[PDB]
Amino acid sequence: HIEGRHMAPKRVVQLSLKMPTHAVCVVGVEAHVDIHSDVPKGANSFRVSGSSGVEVFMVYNRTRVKEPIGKARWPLDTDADMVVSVGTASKELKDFKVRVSYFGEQEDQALGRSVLYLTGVDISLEVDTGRTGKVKRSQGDKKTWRWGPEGYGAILLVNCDRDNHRSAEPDLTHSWLMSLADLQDMSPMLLSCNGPDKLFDSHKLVLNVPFSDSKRVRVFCARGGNSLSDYKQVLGPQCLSYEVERQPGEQEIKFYVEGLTFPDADFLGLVSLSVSLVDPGTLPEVTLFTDTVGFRMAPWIMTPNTQPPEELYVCRVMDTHGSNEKFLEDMSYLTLKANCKLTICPQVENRNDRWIQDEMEFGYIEAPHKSFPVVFDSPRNRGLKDFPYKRILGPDFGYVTREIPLPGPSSLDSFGNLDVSPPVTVGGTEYPLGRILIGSSFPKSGGRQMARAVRNFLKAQQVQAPVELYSDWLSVGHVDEFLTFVPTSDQKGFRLLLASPSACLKLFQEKKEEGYGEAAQFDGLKHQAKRSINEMLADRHLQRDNLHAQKCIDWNRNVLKRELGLAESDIVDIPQLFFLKNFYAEAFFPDMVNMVVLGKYLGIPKPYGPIINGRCCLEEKVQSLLEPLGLHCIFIDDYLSYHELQGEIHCGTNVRRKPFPFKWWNMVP
Numbered sequence: 001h002i003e004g005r006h007m008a009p010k011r012v013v014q015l016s017l018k019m020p021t022h023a024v025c026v027v028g029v030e031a032h033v034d035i036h037s038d039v040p041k042g043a044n045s046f047r048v049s050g051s052s053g054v055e056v057f058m059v060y061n062r063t064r065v066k067e068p069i070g071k072a073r074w075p076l077d078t079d080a081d082m083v084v085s086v087g088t089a090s091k092e093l094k095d096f097k098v099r100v101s102y103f104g105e106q107e108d109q110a111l112g113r114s115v116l117y118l119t120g121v122d123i124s125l126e127v128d129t130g131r132t133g134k135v136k137r138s139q140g141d142k143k144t145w146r147w148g149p150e151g152y153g154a155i156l157l158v159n160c161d162r163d164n165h166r167s168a169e170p171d172l173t174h175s176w177l178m179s180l181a182d183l184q185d186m187s188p189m190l191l192s193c194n195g196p197d198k199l200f201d202s203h204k205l206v207l208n209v210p211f212s213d214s215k216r217v218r219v220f221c222a223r224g225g226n227s228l229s230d231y232k233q234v235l236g237p238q239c240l241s242y243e244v245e246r247q248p249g250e251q252e253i254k255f256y257v258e259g260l261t262f263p264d265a266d267f268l269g270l271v272s273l274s275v276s277l278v279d280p281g282t283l284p285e286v287t288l289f290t291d292t293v294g295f296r297m298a299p300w301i302m303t304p305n306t307q308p309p310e311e312l313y314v315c316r317v318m319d320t321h322g323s324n325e326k327f328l329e330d331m332s333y334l335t336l337k338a339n340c341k342l343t344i345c346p347q348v349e350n351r352n353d354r355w356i357q358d359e360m361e362f363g364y365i366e367a368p369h370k371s372f373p374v375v376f377d378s379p380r381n382r383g384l385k386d387f388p389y390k391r392i393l394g395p396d397f398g399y400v401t402r403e404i405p406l407p408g409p410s411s412l413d414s415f416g417n418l419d420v421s422p423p424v425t426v427g428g429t430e431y432p433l434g435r436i437l438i439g440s441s442f443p444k445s446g447g448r449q450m451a452r453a454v455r456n457f458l459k460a461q462q463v464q465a466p467v468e469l470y471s472d473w474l475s476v477g478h479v480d481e482f483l484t485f486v487p488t489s490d491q492k493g494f495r496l497l498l499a500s501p502s503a504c505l506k507l508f509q510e511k512k513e514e515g516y517g518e519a520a521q522f523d524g525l526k527h528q529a530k531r532s533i534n535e536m537l538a539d540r541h542l543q544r545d546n547l548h549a550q551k552c553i554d555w556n557r558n559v560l561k562r563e564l565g566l567a568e569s570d571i572v573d574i575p576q577l578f579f580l581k582n583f584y585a586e587a588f589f590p591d592m593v594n595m596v597v598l599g600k601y602l603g604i605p606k607p608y609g610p611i612i613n614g615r616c617c618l619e620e621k622v623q624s625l626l627e628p629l630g631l632h633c634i635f636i637d638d639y640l641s642y643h644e645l646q647g648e649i650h651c652g653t654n655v656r657r658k659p660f661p662f663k664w665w666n667m668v669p
């Protein structure tokens with residue numbers, strides 16, 4: 001005795017021995033007919049035959065056992081029902097026939113007959129279902145989505161880009177079509193309406209989207225034909241329904257669908273669209289049939305450093321009494337060996353904001369095919385605020401962002417704190433697109449990534465599925481300081497680079513073990529006080545700093561090894577020394593771990609360490625650690641224009657990379 005339920009309408013066709021009755025039916029859908037409606041003259045049972053292409057079944061009042069009626073006389077008391085099915089689309093109104101004749105024993109033959117005419121219709125909302133090509137035909141009713149190589153329901157791109165140079169904003173925001181090319185960013189939906197036109201003049205087709213999903217999708221259709229001006233928006237944010245304009249000869253109508261919103265805390269990615277069929281000659285109005293399809297918003301995906309470089313971004317900034325042009329030339333040199341485009345953001349756009357790693361994260365979106373990259377513009381909002389929205393966003397490039405309450409952003413909101421791992425299979429559960437890595441304060445306290453918004457947005461994608469690291473011990477507090485990845489021919493393969501104070505102290509002591517002992521730091525050049533190998537080691541302040549730092553990096557090591565399914569062969573420890581200011585960790589010398597990775601070419605900040613027999617020993621320690629993997633180590637001076645400001649090469653650059661060959665829809669999150 002449940003209180004209340006939304007329950008499906010029941011259309012039951014009445015019969016008359018006096019007058020023939022007519023009925024509408026959609027192909028492949030049962031038509032409930034009432035044989036008990038008019039029963040003649042104390043008749044004992046019945047016989048019903050119909051034709052042609054008509055099927056008649058009896059269904060006991062449980063959910064199961066269609067039992068087809070033969071030529072055999074059926075008792076008039078059964079568990080009550082009759083169902084008729086029309087196999088094709090009717091060429092003319094009332095061209096299917098079904099006749100019922102009632103019997104008795106109590107003969108000769110029928111004591112009366114009831115006549116029922118049927119009009120067959122084909123109503124199917126169809127989308128792209130096996131992922132290829134164009135829309136496909138599923139009835140065959142299946143689930144709206146399934147996650148494997150298995151097969152599922154449809155995919156939809158969130159449309160953000162300007163294939164339009166008329167407007168400053170992505171086509172997402174507009175209620176009318178602008179470019180024709182914008183249609184290439186949209187998913188096809190075919191509405192099959194097949195039958196007599198005289199039928200459609202009474203019963204009407206209506207196309208709906210739920211209010212929940214109203215603002216997440218736009219649906220366009222061309223009534224006119226095949227010209228930019230003929231496209232109207234049939235469904236949108238404030239339009240929940242479309243009364244289909246169907247001209248008599250046209251039995252299949254094409255629709256175009258575009259996603260308004262990426263998956264978020266409020267949205268799990270599933271959007272449902274409906275084509276119903278109603279009979280307006282009725283109040284209450286009846287809906288005779290409904291077909292519902294579904295879409296899945298293509299998630300935002302990140303590319304790890306192990307991916308091949310395409311375009312590197314560095315901004316020309318100058319001042320503190322100087323210029324970074326030299327660094328820019330180093331970067332040109334370095335980029336054009338890797339064969340990748342080098343984009344230099346001039347000074348007038350960046351307002352001397354040199355960190356282009358923090359402002360945005362490069363990513364991509366993908367459909368059966370249309371695949372184009374998307375920028376995630378950070379809430380950071382300092383000197384680069386307008387760069388992604390103005391400079392980047394364009395015909396094939398996307399824009400997405402999340403704004404922030406007060407008083408955000410914090411430093412943890414900078415996207416240098418947002419990274420992602422190379423593809424990794426862990427404990428039987430595989431992550432082909434990698435795993436997102438964001439820094440936070442140690443669990444059980446402190447400032448998080450100051451956007452609960454971007455966090456929500458990142459875990460919502462349900463793909464790479466972010467793990468949280470501990471960056472807060474660092475003054476700037478980005479994961480890119482102590483962490484990175486490099487590509488390798490073996491094994492998985494790739495290797496994770498961790499900052500290792502203990503390894504650095506180790507190196508210095510083992511070279512103190514040789515004559516070698518007093519070669520100093522910041523040797524290469526200087527206005528800044530030289531210092532040694534042995535009062536490193538003799539000083540214990542800095543080693544409190546470095547043992548603490550190494551401890552924190554050890555914690556992050558346990559987390560990373562656990563979550564990414566890593567073994568010590570995967571990890572490589574790059575020597576790095578830190579120091580403490582106001583309880584927070586800065587870098588003692590430029591941070592080598594923070595570096596730009598382009599293929600086997602690694603742009604690295606140049607530490608100035610002990611000079612022993614012609615070389616910086618730290619540099620060559622690194623070379624000995626890396627080069628055997630095939631990685632050529634290039635050392636670039638970032639010192640005055642970057643390190644002085646507590647940032648390094650990777651942090652002063654931003655790299656867009658080639659999307660994964662693997663297709664996100666083929667994994668199982």
Ligand SMILES: [Ca+2]
Pocket residue numbers: 159160161162163171181182185
């Ligand atoms: Ca577009």
Ligand SMILES: [Ca+2]
Pocket residue numbers: 377378379380381384385386
């Ligand atoms: Ca911004």
Ligand SMILES: [Ca+2]
Pocket residue numbers: 161163181182184185372395396
């Ligand atoms: Ca496009």
Ligand SMILES: [Ca+2]
Pocket residue numbers: 357361415416417418419480
């Ligand atoms: Ca990053």
